[PDB]
């Protein structure tokens, strides 16, 4: 028999299946002998200690900055003072160097939140002795000369001596649950074009500059022995906290500066000498 098929349905024709997503379903056609075969990971597989998310990368300790601390630095003097924003390093100049892994991964996202961790490693010995106070300051910032204003915030006085390292969690205290990134979401300028106000006027977003600072001031002036160095260097590391969070994938803030060469056809393009 040849009976008529009466069953039907209304379909909405789309070109691609789940084009913009990073999960779910897909209409992909495997270029294999077997249509449902996959790459075996029986022997060769991802090692357990490799970062599975970007939040694992943002928990790697990177060296942010350095500064000096001499015997000549009178009490209350700002040794270190930066705007602690993971979005951008500077607002007023071109940056070049080695950005920390938590800053590198942050630059991929439009929003961040949660605490940030610091770690101050004093490149010293047993015979160095001083005291610094590390303060986190929100919304309103202190004057350079008024140390008292810095003391009336969230502080951790570190007594340097035998121990040469102090950890400091910066508590996340802002008006919004997530801050937005100060770096632009999309920037088509690639040829270092000379910028004007008409260019600025037609930007992608408005840079909401962070006023949150972390200052390090002298409490007890560094009094080393005669036989050792009068000035030490301090290394300031930085990673995202245990509750660090990112959202909204954008065009990356940072890009490779050193040793970038575009690919060519090998060996058509005069590889044979």
């Amino acid at each position: 028999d040849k009976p008529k098929d009466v069953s039907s349905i209304t379909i909405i024709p789309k070109p691609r299946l789940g084009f913009p997503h990073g999960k779910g379903k897909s209409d992909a056609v495997a270029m294999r002998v077997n249509p449902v075969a996959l790459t075996s990971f029986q022997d060769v597989s991802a090692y357990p200690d490799e970062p599975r998310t970007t939040l694992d990368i943002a928990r790697i300790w990177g060296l942010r900055s350095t500064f000096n601390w001499g015997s000549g630095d009178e009490h209350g003097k700002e040794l270190f003072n930066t705007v602690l924003d993971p979005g951008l390093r500077f607002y007023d100049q071109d940056y070049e160097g080695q950005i920390t892994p938590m800053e590198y991964v942050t630059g991929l996202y439009n929003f961040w939140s949660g605490p940030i961790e610091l770690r101050f490693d004093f490149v010293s010995n047993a015979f160095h002795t001083g005291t610094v106070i590390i303060s986190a300051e929100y919304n309103r910032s202190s004057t350079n000369t008024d140390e008292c204003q810095s003391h009336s915030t969230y502080t951790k006085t570190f007594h340097l001596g035998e121990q040469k390292s102090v950890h400091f969690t910066v508590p996340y205290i802002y008006d919004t649950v997530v801050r937005r990134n100060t770096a632009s979401a999309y920037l088509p300028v690639t040829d270092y074009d000379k910028v004007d106000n008409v260019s600025r006027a037609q930007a992608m977003g408005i840079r909401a500059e962070s006023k949150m600072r972390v200052k390090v001031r002298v409490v007890n002036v560094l009094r080393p022995v005669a036989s050792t160095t009068s000035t030490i260097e301090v290394l300031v590391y930085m990673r995202g906290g245990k509750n660090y969070a990112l959202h909204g994938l954008k065009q990356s803030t940072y890009w490779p500066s050193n040793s970038v060469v575009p690919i060519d056809s090998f060996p058509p393009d005069g590889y044979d000498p």
Binding site: P15, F19, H21, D27, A28, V29, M31, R32, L38, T39, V44, E50, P51, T53, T54, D56, I60, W61, F90, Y91, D94, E96, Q98, T100, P101, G114, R119, S165, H167, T169, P171, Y172, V177, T182, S184, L187, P188, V189, T190, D191, R200, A203, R207, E209, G241, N243, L246, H247, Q251, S252, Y254, W255, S257, V260, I263, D264, S265, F266, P267, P273
Partner: protein, 243 residues
């Protein structure tokens, strides 16, 4: 990878860690590495094909610093913004990858003329763009698709885009992501180990095309390298929130 918690010997009191803000705005969590690399990246933006050549070669490698534009050098058919994608920045940290990729081709046509796609397995060379293979002046008799390699076909009128999933055909455990120099003439068997093959795209007549790429479902990166030395100038091309 190394956390660096090794060096965290401090055991003194600290401020609270609070509560995670994950899943607060929406459940859609975008933090996973295997979700970012599974997002499609654009490669060739309205590049031209020819029937006069063997076809258009697309070397099967993930998008990274290899496919980056530097200012004031030779012009390529690759789009300039491959360098600065989130999907590239991830591949700049991992030097090994393994598993299938997913190329998406979009022909700018609605004709009955069929376009073909051909996965050539890892054969050692790393060519891209249009090529006259063996310098012949006629390929219509002996086409690259007709030789008898795995081959799908687009028919623009029915649907002017396909999504293929090219297998990890190689003798290596891992395909290498990047080099310190792409244009350097070093030992020839090692230069080949940064691709796992090629896509070729032959048309009947001349036509334009766009190519995207991403990681397949079966895809793992490894051999973490940390972040590179970088430059930025985003500050410069935007107004402050204070005029």
């Amino acid at each position: 990878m190394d956390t660096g918690a090794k060096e965290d010997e401090d055991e003194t009191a600290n401020f609270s860690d609070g509560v995670t803000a994950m899943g607060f705005q929406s459940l859609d969590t975008q933090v996973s590495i295997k979700d970012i690399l599974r997002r499609p990246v654009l490669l060739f933006n309205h590049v031209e094909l020819d029937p006069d050549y063997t076809g258009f070669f697309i070397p099967i490698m993930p998008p990274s610093r290899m496919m980056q534009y530097k200012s004031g050098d030779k012009e390529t058919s690759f789009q300039r913004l491959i360098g600065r994608t989130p999907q590239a920045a991830i591949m700049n940290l991992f030097r090994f990858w393994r598993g299938s990729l997913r190329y998406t081709i979009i022909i700018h046509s609605t004709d009955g003329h069929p376009i073909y796609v051909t996965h050539v397995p890892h054969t050692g060379n790393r060519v891209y763009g249009l090529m006259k293979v063996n310098n012949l002046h006629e390929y219509t008799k002996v086409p690259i698709f007709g030789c008898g390699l795995t081959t799908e076909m687009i028919i623009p009128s029915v649907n002017p885009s396909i999504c293929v999933e090219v297998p990890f055909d190689t003798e290596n455990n891992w395909a290498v992501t990047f080099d310190e120099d792409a244009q350097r003439n070093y030992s020839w068997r090692d230069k080949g180990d940064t691709v796992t093959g090629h896509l070729v795209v032959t048309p009947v007549v001349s036509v334009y095309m766009s190519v995207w790429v991403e990681a397949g479902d079966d895809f793992e990166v490894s051999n973490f390298y940390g972040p590179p030395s970088v430059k930025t100038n985003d500050w410069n091309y935007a107004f402050s929130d204070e005029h």
